[PDB]
Amino acid sequence: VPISFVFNRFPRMVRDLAKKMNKEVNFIMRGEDTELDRTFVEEIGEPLLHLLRNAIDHGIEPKEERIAKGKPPIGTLILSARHEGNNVVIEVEDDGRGIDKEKIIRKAIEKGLIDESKAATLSDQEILNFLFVPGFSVGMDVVKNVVESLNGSISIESEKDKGTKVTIRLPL
Ligand SMILES: Oc1cccc(O)c1
């Protein structure tokens, strides 16, 4: 199928979520032509919807907050697909507040998963990996479990005030 069978439902959903959350969102879709196995298109919808929800809820800041921090007033959400080899790569990127890595660390210490000394030398990717720990947080463990049932991989990149990029790699 073209991935557009999934991507064509997101403009309405993002718009309804942005309206519910009183948030101004510039939503852009690219690579909707990208074709992949029907089993993927039937299952990739729900995980991508979760990621779009997360970006709009926890990521994108309200216009007035963006203006106070000197950002472009309306936040941007980009959903993309492309071919890489015999994989498909799907990206959800926002220019919102990003993931607070210091908050992750604090929570991880509170949950007994690491001590303060070990937290000081963690890389950014080991920190962000805490989000995939079942109910660490949102929902990144359940997104992971679906991608994994499709034999895909997922990664997250994030920087404070810069934004967040989640990338899903799928086989075929
Ligand atoms: O902007 C964000 C923040 C948190 C999780 C997410 O998938 C996106």
Author numbering: 5 to 141, 154 to 188
Excerpt from the publication:
Prototypical HKs are membrane-bound dimers comprising a sensor domain that detects their cognate stimuli, a catalytic ATP binding domain (CA) that binds ATP and, upon signal detection, autophosphorylates a conserved histidine in the dimerization, and a histidine phosphotransfer domain (DHp). The ATP-binding pocket of HKs adopts the Bergerat fold, an α/β sandwich characterized by four conserved regions (the N-box, the G1-box, the G2-box, and the G3-box) and the highly variable ATP-lid. The Bergerat fold has been observed in the ATP-binding domain of the GHKL protein superfamily, which includes DNA gyrases, the molecular chaperone Hsp90, bacterial HKs, and the MutL mismatch repair enzyme.
Our attempts to co-crystallize the DPP derivative with the CA domain of CheA from T. maritima, a class II HK for which robust crystallization protocols have been established, failed. However, we successfully obtained the X-ray crystal structure of the resorcinol fragment bound to CheA-CA with a resolution of 2.1 Å. The overall structure showed a solvent-accessible binding pocket where the resorcinol was observed making contact with the conserved aspartate (Asp449): the one hydroxyl from the resorcinol is in the proximity of the conserved aspartate (Asp449) and the ordered water molecule W1, while the other hydroxyl of the resorcinol forms water-bridged contacts with the backbone carbonyl a leucine residue (Leu406; Val386 in PhoQ E. coli). The binding mode of the resorcinol resembles the predicted binding mode of DPP-5 and is nearly identical to the interaction formed by the DPP CCT018159 with Hsp90α. The crystal binding mode of the resorcinol fragment supports the hypothesis that resorcinol-containing DPP compounds are likely to retain the binding mode observed in Hsp90. Docking studies indicate that the substitution pattern on ring A influences the binding mode, with the resorcinol-based derivatives likely to adopt a binding mode analogous to the crystal-bound complex of CCT018159-Hsp90α, an observation also supported by the X-ray crystal structure of resorcinol in complex with the HK CheA. The CheA-CA domain was crystallized by the sitting-drop vapor-diffusion method at 21°C using 0.4 µL of 25 mg/mL CheA-CA protein mixed with 0.4 µL of reservoir solution containing 30% (wt/vol) PEG 8000, 0.6 M ammonium acetate, 0.065 M sodium acetate pH 4.5.
